[PDB]
Design a protein around this ligand. Structure first.
Ligand SMILES: [Mn+2]
Length: 178
């Protein structure tokens, strides 16, 4: 499993194995992010396992990851939801297409990515993968956004920045509406 390096203008330049890519000087690469809602409209918030290299044990949006060579962002989203959650989803739909970010976790790890954000719906029961996720909560988006506005540090930096963007928020809030 790798990561696709990117230059200033967002043009692929190479490939770096994932574990070796994330350090105290991580280079810009391709990534994605997704917020999943169940049939009933409940938002799925997950907690990253204690063993993850970056932001271990942190609460964040449903699923996020790295697209591989020759893989579309939407197929990447689908692959990680089956891998990390063992769950099926509806065609992932844009929420925040131009999302870019750089943050530094508790032990100096840095994430530097161009992260298009997507939202989707769950079409099957969760089959949590213990190596990736240690816990999860099905809740009201309203609350989650309230928590993010009050205590941001309690969640992943990207979950915060994503829901702090006006358009993304309105889009997430309407997402469950028929
Ligand atoms: Mn990354």
């Amino acid at each position: 499993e790798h990561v696709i390096l990117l230059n200033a203008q967002g043009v692929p330049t190479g490939t770096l194995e994932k574990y070796a890519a994330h350090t105290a000087d991580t280079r810009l690469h391709l990534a994605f992010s997704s917020w999943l809602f169940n049939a009933k409209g409940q938002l799925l918030v997950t907690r990253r396992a204690l063993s993850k290299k970056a932001w271990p044990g942190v609460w964040t949006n449903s699923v996020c990851g790295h697209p591989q060579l020759g893989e579309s962002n939407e197929d990447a989203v689908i692959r990680r939801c089956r891998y990390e959650l063992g769950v099926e989803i509806t065609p992932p739909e844009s929420i925040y297409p131009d999302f870019r970010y750089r943050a530094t976790d508790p032990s100096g790890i840095v994430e530097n990515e161009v992260c298009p954000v997507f939202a989707a719906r769950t079409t099957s029961a969760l089959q949590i993968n213990d190596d990736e996720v240690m816990d999860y909560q099905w809740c009201d988006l309203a609350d989650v956004l309230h928590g993010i506005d009050a205590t941001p540090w309690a969640f992943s930096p990207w979950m915060v920045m994503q829901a702090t963007n006006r358009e993304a928020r309105k889009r997430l809030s309407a997402f469950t509406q028929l």
